[PDB]
Amino acid sequence: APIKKIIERYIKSKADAWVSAAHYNRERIKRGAHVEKTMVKKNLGRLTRLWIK
């Protein structure tokens, strides 16, 4: 239980950090604000995944 719980919490944290980041990236893309091609691709992928979820 405890170890598992801790792991869960950290993955939640990661998600929070990740999802927010993705959102930010998307916003940037929408604007037209020096997005990296690779970064944009990642955002597209990540965002797609999020949508699916």
Next chain:
RNA sequence: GAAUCUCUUUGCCUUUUGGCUUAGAUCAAGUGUAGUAUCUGUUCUUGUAACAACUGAAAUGACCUAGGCUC
């Protein structure tokens, strides 16, 4: 009773793994794109006799203190 050895079970053991990213990407393409670099064979290359002169070289080793004669 004490010493030791052999086997079995439990505990202990890699009853199996040292990262992240768009599962990293793709199982497709008359490709495009940028750069970096030089080659084929065919040929040139006097004799005879007489007189004057020498009779012989080289190798390493035997003597003496690189040099000097002998074998």
